Design a protein around this ligand. Sequence first.
Ligand code: 82U
Ligand code: 82U
Ligand code: CL
Ligand code: CL
Ligand code: K
Ligand code: K
Ligand code: NA
Ligand code: NA
Lengths: 876, 876
Amino acid sequence: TYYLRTFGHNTMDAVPRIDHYRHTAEKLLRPSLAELHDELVVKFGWIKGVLVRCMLNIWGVMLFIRLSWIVGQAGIGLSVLVIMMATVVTTITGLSTSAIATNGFVRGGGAYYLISRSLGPEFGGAIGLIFAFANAVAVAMYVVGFAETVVELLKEHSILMIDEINDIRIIGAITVVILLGISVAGMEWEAKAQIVLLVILLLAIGDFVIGTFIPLESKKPKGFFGYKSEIFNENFGPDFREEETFFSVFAIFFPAATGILAGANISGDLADPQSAIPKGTLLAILITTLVYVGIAVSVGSCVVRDATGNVNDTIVTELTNCTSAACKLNFDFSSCESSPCSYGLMNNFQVMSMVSGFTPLISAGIFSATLSSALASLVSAPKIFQALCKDNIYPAFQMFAKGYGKNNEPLRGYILTFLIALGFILIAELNVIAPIISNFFLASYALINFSVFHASLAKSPGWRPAFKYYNMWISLLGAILCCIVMFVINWWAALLTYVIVLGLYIYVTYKKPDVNWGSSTQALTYLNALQHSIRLSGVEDHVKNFRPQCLVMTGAPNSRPALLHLVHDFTKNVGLMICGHVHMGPRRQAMKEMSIDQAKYQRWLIKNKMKAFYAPVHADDLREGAQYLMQAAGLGRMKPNTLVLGFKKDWLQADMRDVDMYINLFHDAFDIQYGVVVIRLKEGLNTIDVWWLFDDGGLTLLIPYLLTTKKKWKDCKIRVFIGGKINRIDHDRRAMATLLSKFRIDFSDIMVLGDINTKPKKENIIAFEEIIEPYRLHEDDKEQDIADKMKEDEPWRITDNELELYKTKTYRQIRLNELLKEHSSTANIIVMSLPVARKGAVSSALYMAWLEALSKDLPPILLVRGNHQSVLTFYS
Amino acid sequence: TYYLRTFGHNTMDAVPRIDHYRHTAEKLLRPSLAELHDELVVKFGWIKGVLVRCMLNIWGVMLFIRLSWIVGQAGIGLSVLVIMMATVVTTITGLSTSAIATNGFVRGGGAYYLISRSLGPEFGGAIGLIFAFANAVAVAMYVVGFAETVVELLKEHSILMIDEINDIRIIGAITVVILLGISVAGMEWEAKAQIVLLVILLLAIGDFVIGTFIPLESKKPKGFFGYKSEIFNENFGPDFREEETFFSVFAIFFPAATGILAGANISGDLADPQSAIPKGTLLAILITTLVYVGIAVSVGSCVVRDATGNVNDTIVTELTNCTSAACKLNFDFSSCESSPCSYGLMNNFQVMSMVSGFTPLISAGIFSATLSSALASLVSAPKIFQALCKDNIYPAFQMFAKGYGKNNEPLRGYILTFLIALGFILIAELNVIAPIISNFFLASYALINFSVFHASLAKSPGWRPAFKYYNMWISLLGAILCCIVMFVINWWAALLTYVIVLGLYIYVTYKKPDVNWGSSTQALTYLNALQHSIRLSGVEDHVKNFRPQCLVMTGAPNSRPALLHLVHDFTKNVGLMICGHVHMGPRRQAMKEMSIDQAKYQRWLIKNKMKAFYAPVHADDLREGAQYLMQAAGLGRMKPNTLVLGFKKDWLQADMRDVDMYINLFHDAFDIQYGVVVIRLKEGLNTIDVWWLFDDGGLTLLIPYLLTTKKKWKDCKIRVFIGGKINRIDHDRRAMATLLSKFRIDFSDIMVLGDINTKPKKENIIAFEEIIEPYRLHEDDKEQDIADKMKEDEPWRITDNELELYKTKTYRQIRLNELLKEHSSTANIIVMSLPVARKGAVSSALYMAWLEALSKDLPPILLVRGNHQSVLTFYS
Ligand SMILES: CCCCNc1cc(C(=O)O)cc(S(N)(=O)=O)c1Oc1ccccc1
Ligand SMILES: CCCCNc1cc(C(=O)O)cc(S(N)(=O)=O)c1Oc1ccccc1
Ligand SMILES: [Cl-]
Ligand SMILES: [Cl-]
Ligand SMILES: [K+]
Ligand SMILES: [K+]
Ligand code: NA
Ligand code: NA
């Protein structure tokens, strides 16, 4: 029966499957909500790819040469502490790297890809460039270590080509060329070389361990004695026998702990990360740390610090106190504290190859240790560089993004890193440059830990690490410790690397590349905005804290640029600006139109440096869309309180439905207690005159003050016009002066006008009547059928009863325009009180004609009507 | 002739008057917008009340006693440097005080009133308590200085009552009693006493200056020589003949620079501030600094450092070189370096009373200098205390706010400060206390400067200070310098004062007093929220940055508390919660209802730790108000994307118009790309089962993950139910497991059901039909009048054609409820996919019955339908 078929076969709705969430690597092409609702070649495992590579990269030129010197200059306990501090740093860094790795599929590159996809392209580009350069230099430094041991073994025998430095450069160039050859040959060959070096190095470590368990009398003159408790108690203690300190020993040891990201830098060639990187990196760190601690302890409890290389030392046991621990085992290697004696645990770096068995085996271990790390860094650098260049963060380096072969191999990057390493090898004296490279590595580790902390601070639902044990405070502590260790090693190198990081960050944030990766920075932006708004929602309103929160019915924010600039003038950095656009038409097309317009106009607002919000709505007409915006726009206490309208210039030649809707917008704004600002200015193209004739709470006074508080209008002086009575001009002038001095509003002059409430000129009244003519109802000259006109061609038709009952207001508007023409004709901008027409008593056409008559033939003028709630105060 | 009357007489709209902005000190007030729209005893001047008080408070014990010691230890140049540094601190503090005091009317109080009204009651209360205590201690300090000079002048004669440390207390108690008496007498009496002390002190200064232009041979054995250029060139340079440094000298000098707020603590008795405090304080600071500099230079270029007072010191032109500025004038006061000589600039503090003429005049200058400052502190402390107590910030001190007499005089505070000063006088050894009091004053000054900087960083339109020359960077610099100077003297005193300020601030912010003064803190809250939202508006959306932005149709947010808590569970700290309320009725009453409910419900939300926004609207019905909210609610990119509704539990016993409106809310949400979440739980009042059978983009999966994120559901494990095919259970289960492992969604078990698509039980289908019957159209048994029935009692009437076209979907809902009953009966919460009914094809009643049949008789269940835009991702 079909009752037992595939669920979801008898419906259009699709069951969840991986094909709906897969970008490119289809099935059923998951149905849209409308369709359901609308009316009808080389891959490595974690062992060979991560564990082995990190293992080899960590173990370099120090495990077999300089570690004994460290256990000599500092005690066994102090050496263990030095090891454990860097181990803690690398362990926290590895935990953070794992947490970043288990968040999603990592395409290619290493630490760069993780950092850039975690917290964006600025830190990402900075750390990518710095880490790539650090690996390129580390190639030269490991090769220089190889050259040093080669020339040392040649000088031990009878062989020398040129001066020691020149021979070092000559051999190092050859080895770097050979390493470039192996790297170019491909990744499988690199892996084979890596595993053979791993087995040789493990054999060398076993050789050393077996050697320390078989003491011989030939090495008795040396420091070798074979795990004598006297040596243990003697070497346990900080004997710094030169211009050396604990911090300097830590600075010397720290480069050994690096290389933890060799496996993570291969992510572009791993079978799958999110399973390989975490366990491989953690196991590598654990094993390397255990080996370091064990070998340090063994060499400290088996070799004495000072030793004289002569069989002439005797064990006769003659009369001697010999409080030192050298004599307790025998008289060999004693009393070379007066003059510099040849060797021991403080003057010999070959002691590792001494206390062992087969010494050429230890030399081969040296070669393998220093060459595996160089190969790892030489592979690591171009992968990171190519991953960063594919993103085109720095357009100048686009050439190095190319790949070759079946597996994308950056041969240009290989050539570039080979050239950089070769250049740094010819110098061959890199002890000055080593702290800078260590600080670069530390900066990369610190920003990895900060990446985890920052992604955990922002609470993005898409953070979701698969790897547990990644506490955010532990990662923040790891970043802090990385910075501290960076400063401990060569303070000025740390300052310089901070300078480079900051400069690259600024350059990237100025270039502003067009990439969107869902970084933790954007999530943190959202979280900050939400938390700040929630905090603001609990703040009680107060009069001194009032701001003009303006909703402007600009439609497209491009139609009236000058108007939007003017509104921005008294809103930018003070209050809120919402650009309201109402879209009409069929719903399906209008939704797409709004989606396109939102992006386009928000981008235009950002590009033109406007601090405005775009608020598009869909409604059947302008009035109800404005109703939507005036009822619901905003969030919490950031809702608008003022409606800003551009003057309807074409109302004379337009359908009176449109002007009726304009005036109804006025009425609705007054209905829900909004202030209204009407702006009339010439869109084609020093005093600010404020005619404050009616008390609206002070909005018509507050707007021009905010105008003068900006640099654009800083040179314009506010002068005030108020209404008064003749023969009392000075009294009212002084009252106004004291009133706005209590408001601390700077003014240049106050003009009291007594010519208001006087009949305007005959020509002006004739012109107003001529303008009014085609909108009169003329009920006096008509029969009772005019009531039908009052319900069909209306309520915009102008009646005779209201034209006679409001003739005072009409004359006041005309006379006020005459006064504005006579006085404020040469003002930069005019702010004037906006008349309020009582709803249900004044037709739309009469209101619009009042505004036209009052505003005609004037410089930029603002008609303002406040909410009649107090907006100013003179109380503290 | 009425055309020339008062403007605004023939209209209802008023003209701007002072009475419209006056709290209590009439007229007809300002007419409301609705009315125009809706259809039918001691006061001081700045000279006496500020300038004199500040000059008297600044000049204390040091001006006439220890200034010479400072000029002796440090050089003339370093003395001028110390004076200028303290002057810079006090001048920036005075500019900041001026800027704060020229904003609004300052009722009473002093620096407390300014600080509290500028940046709120927390810092305000802290600094009020600290400054009041500091002035109370300073009373005892100045009284102790007066007692010390009295006892010194008594010991110069043969008079002595008891041991010096006890005679000091005996005299100091008497002087503090007399000071309390004169303070209690009244303001006018205190002013007269201050004026006479000012004239006596000016006479003493003139005495010193007149006596320095009169070199007498009787004072020649001492350091007095009378402006010899050798002394000028010799008294430069820092010769510290003790364990004293430059910083210690500065610490000794700084208490002389304080007292700059004496005229600002009298603000409650000034004729008018905003004009008295600025000019008076600045002029007082300038005058005091000029006098300090002149006195330092004069006494440095006139008196030598060391002087062995003896007539036997003569200069008979003996054979000697003596390359020092002692013999160049004469042999007097020469060679007292082997043993400490009796006096001079370094060993004498009475040198001021010696250089001058009449010496008792200088002693009276000492007395006036100490007593005027003590009186100023004793007056200022209770004024600040009673201003702080009138606000009830600390309700334990409410008894100290009451005043007696015509002018409100805090007599209780007077007794309190008298008792504190008397207690500190009995100790009589306050040199340990001194750094604490200096640090208290410095903290007060620093927070004044920070008040100006804060009010300038926030850009409140109501900041508007009347005093220019108040650059905010200079104020920030002054605050930083005040902190630095606080640290320079007695670092641990600075730590202690920071501890007290921090503790008082925490206590006040925990007590949360009910005041609202329009502080700069609230303005900065608004500015920060706006800036963060503007920054967020320029952030491109990404899939892994998606958050659930939910608009919940709660109505009153306390009607369904369990539903509100559940929505909060997956919204708190992640995404946005908007509580939508639709208000109906007449507009005039509904606006007032909305205004009341906004405050009430926002306060209720805050008081229950809910991070939700209240969004009330006025609309004709629920549907169009919800349309308002879905179209316009939110600011920028912080707009809702999901609609959350509670289940209509009473839909059976309700008018079908309401349920039709509910289902139309569903359809409208689906129309504009909104997810819908339906929640059905018992309002009366461990696994999370997710039955997500259709791919909505992942919202049905994302919500219960966010549920498990919270600590309330941290013990609940997500287990998943999907629809599959029999005999392919394991393959589908594995596919689901890998899909949600790529999503990093932790699950306990996956259950695949093949029993879906099978016919439900007979009893359940019978019950569904019985519930359905009352809303059936039954057109098969009727005539063409059913078409009219399908237009009036409609479109909620259920047709037979759709009941047959969607019988499979009905059976699926019933069967799914059976499966939920048998499987998820014990779950803590159930999340299930929400069926999508195609608009125009399924009646409202059929859709509601589908939901009811699906979710009936179950634990708390969520029906979720996502946007069908991708919400999860497995890409990094
Ligand atoms: C940034 C680390 C890159 C390799 N450099 C580093 C590696 C190791 C090691 O153990 O991997 C040990 C040392 S060190 N302190 O010399 O013993 C190294 O410092 C060098 C090496 C050679 C030239 C100059 C500095
Ligand atoms: C916080 C300031 C309160 C007054 N105390 C202060 C005032 C003046 C002055 O000139 O007004 C000078 C000094 S001084 N020369 O440093 O001792 C004063 O320190 C004293 C005074 C007496 C007892 C202990 C400390
Ligand atoms: Cl690394
Ligand atoms: Cl003060
Ligand atoms: K290493
Ligand atoms: K003083
Ligand atoms: Na290596
Ligand atoms: Na004084």
